[PDB]
Amino acid sequence: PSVFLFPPKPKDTLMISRTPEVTCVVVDVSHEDPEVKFNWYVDGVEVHNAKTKPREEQYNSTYRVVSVLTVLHQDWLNGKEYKCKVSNKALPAPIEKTISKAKGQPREPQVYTLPPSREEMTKNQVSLTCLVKGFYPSDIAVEWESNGQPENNYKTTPPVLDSDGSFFLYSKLTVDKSRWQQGNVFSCSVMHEALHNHYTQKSLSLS
Amino acid sequence: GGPSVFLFPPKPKDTLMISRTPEVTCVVVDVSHEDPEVKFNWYVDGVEVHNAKTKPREEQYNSTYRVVSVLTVLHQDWLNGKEYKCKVSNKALPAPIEKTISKAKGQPREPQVYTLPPSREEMTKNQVSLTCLVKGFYPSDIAVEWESNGQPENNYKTTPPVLDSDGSFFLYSKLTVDKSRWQQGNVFSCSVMHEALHNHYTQKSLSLS
Ligand SMILES: *[C@@H]1O[C@H](CO[C@@H]2O[C@@H](C)[C@@H](O)[C@@H](O)[C@@H]2O)[C@@H](O[C@@H]2O[C@H](CO)[C@@H](O[C@@H]3O[C@H](CO[C@H]4O[C@H](CO)[C@@H](O)[C@H](O)[C@@H]4O[C@@H]4O[C@H](CO)[C@@H](O[C@@H]5O[C@H](CO[C@]6(C(=O)O)C[C@H](O)[C@@H](NC(C)=O)[C@H]([C@H](O)[C@H](O)CO)O6)[C@H](O)[C@H](O)[C@H]5O)[C@H](O)[C@H]4NC(C)=O)[C@@H](O)[C@H](O[C@H]4O[C@H](CO)[C@@H](O)[C@H](O)[C@@H]4O[C@@H]4O[C@H](CO)[C@@H](O)[C@H](O)[C@H]4NC(C)=O)[C@@H]3O)[C@H](O)[C@H]2NC(C)=O)[C@H](O)[C@H]1NC(C)=O
Ligand SMILES: *[C@@H]1O[C@H](CO[C@@H]2O[C@@H](C)[C@@H](O)[C@@H](O)[C@@H]2O)[C@@H](O[C@@H]2O[C@H](CO)[C@@H](O[C@@H]3O[C@H](CO[C@H]4O[C@H](CO)[C@@H](O)[C@H](O)[C@@H]4O[C@@H]4O[C@H](CO)[C@@H](O[C@@H]5O[C@H](CO)[C@H](O)[C@H](O)[C@H]5O)[C@H](O)[C@H]4NC(C)=O)[C@@H](O)[C@H](O[C@H]4O[C@H](CO)[C@@H](O)[C@H](O)[C@@H]4O[C@@H]4O[C@H](CO)[C@@H](O[C@@H]5O[C@H](CO)[C@H](O)[C@H](O)[C@H]5O)[C@H](O)[C@H]4NC(C)=O)[C@@H]3O)[C@H](O)[C@H]2NC(C)=O)[C@H](O)[C@H]1NC(C)=O
Ligand SMILES: [Cl-]
Ligand SMILES: [Cl-]
């Protein structure tokens, strides 16, 4: 059987209101050795409050058994080390994967907004750009707002690694050229641990 | 509990540059000890070909074999959407496995390319960032570079193609330059290679003011 350990969503670890969960996925458990017994540890110290989900048989030969652990916000942002430990008869020794927040100094993202280029202004819709660079680790979340209302016609590139070991990304919001003319304000907002209040906003409006 | 086949396409740049070699790799894994021999047959649009380079078997750390076979593809063949089928045979299988690969089947779309300068707030920095927006292209195979005067700049990074809401793709490319070098009106150039541009190449330039 094969063990895969997953980290929480970036907004879940950043907002005091939400619930971050580290997940531990067991795959390839036989119908003759079906017993999977987990053992979680936070800095090697065993915890018992994991919520093992209903065992679901995957559509092939085998089941997959998933254990959800809520993590403390302080702990994950102090990159404590979460050890999943799945035991099965079919295994030689118990398998032990280990996840944590990315090690090293957290670095503040720089957030810049870029307005559509003139060549684009000839088209029906235009492209509002948000550059976010110099941040570490790569766990981040980017959204678009206008008139304090969620804009949702955007796409964001993945974090790309840069020469200093920090990350950058761009987010592109697509709007009707008409709407951007008449100088509406559109806002790019970024949530990252290194920010004060784990949030910054920047904005952009027709000059 | 049987061998698994995986068939990979050529790298984007390799399909787009006349100097590179675009190749199709067919990888067999989970080959057992008692049934280790793997036979490859390769078909280009249904016609069998006999110049793949099949590598020797190679035992992996998990006590199974991995056997691969590499077929070079012609640049024009791949771009015209020929279909490359790898037929793997192995005594542990009920009948041969067949996988087929080709270019992406959707309607080609010319990339539109827009250059963006630094933002005013960025200028207060020691190093500023020149931005290329390549959008609306399809398929996602694309290559992007930067050029100054006539030499290829080498402090750029490019995002992967991102799937847009119309089923085409976009990416951005970022180049980091000295603020004082963008100052003084130097020209920088963003070159894009894509199957559906004329001569498969377009170039856009960025200057101060
Ligand atoms: C049999 O079968 C099985 C199964 O399968 C299936 O089925 C079948 C029938 C078919 O179809 C298939 O195909 C399918 O799939 C199988 O199994 C398998 O296995 C494998 C192995 O073998 C594996 O693999 C792996 O994977 C990984 C990942 O994955 C991912 O992705 C995918 C896609 O496709 C998917 O599917 C998966 O699942 C995943 O995902 C993920 O997950 C996770 C967990 O869970 C998560 O997390 C989480 O999340 C959550 C969320 O939430 C929620 C939301 O959403 O929000 C909540 C809410 O409330 C709700 N909502 C509502 C409205 O309701 C929701 C709900 O619930 C629902 O969902 C809705 O519907 O929810 C939260 O947030 C938490 O907190 C968290 O935690 C996530 O999200 C997801 N995501 C996504 C995107 O999706 C990967 O990664 C891997 O890779 C790795 O590994 C390898 C080796 O191993 C290598 O090669 C690579 O490279 C990698 O590596 C790595 O790397 C890194 C860096 O680089 C490092 O770090 C490390 O260390 C490394 N490692 C090593 C080297 O080792 C792989 O790929 C898979 O997964 C499986 N699958 C499954 C499905 O499970 C089996 O196998 C078979 N058998 C045979 C074939 O024989
Ligand atoms: C044992 O072992 C072995 C080995 O391994 C090793 O060892 C171990 C022990 C450890 O250590 C580890 O770590 C190592 O590695 C194994 O094997 C394995 O197996 C697995 C399975 O099981 C596999 O997996 C797969 O994968 C893939 C990918 O892969 C890649 O990547 C990775 C990372 O991640 C790596 O690892 C690999 O290698 C690969 O890589 C690649 O490769 C290639 C070749 O070479 C390359 O390319 C090339 O290159 C060259 C240079 O060199 C030149 O350039 C040329 O030109 C070319 O050709 C590349 O680059 C690379 N990459 C990188 C590195 O990055 C994936 O894909 C898969 O997945 C898939 O499948 C699955 C199934 O199974 C599923 O689930 C998923 O989902 C997927 O799916 C797919 O998908 C797609 C999309 O999505 C599709 O398509 C589609 O279709 C549709 C229809 O409707 C539509 O049309 C659309 O549009 C489209 O798109 C397809 O179809 C699908 N498929 C299916 C479903 O089927 C997987 O994941 C792996 O790979 C392996 N590995 C190796 C190494 O081999 C075994 O297993 C063991 N055993 C036991 C028992 O355990
Ligand atoms: Cl807490
Ligand atoms: Cl050729």
Curated annotation (Swiss-Prot), chain A:
Effect caused by changing N197A: Impaired ability to activate the classical complement pathway
Glycosylation sites noted in the Swiss-Prot or TrEMBL record: N60
Effect ascribed to mutating H198R: Enhanced ability to activate the classical complement pathway
Boundaries of every Ig-like domain copy: 1-100, 109-205
Residue ranges, annotated region (Constant (C) domain): 1-207
Subcellular location per the Swiss-Prot or TrEMBL entry: Secreted; Cell membrane
Effect of Y63R: Impaired ability to activate the classical complement pathway
Effect of Y63 to D/A: Enhanced ability to activate the classical complement pathway
UniProt-recorded name of the protein: Immunoglobulin gamma-1 heavy chain
Whole-protein residues included: 240 to 446 of 449
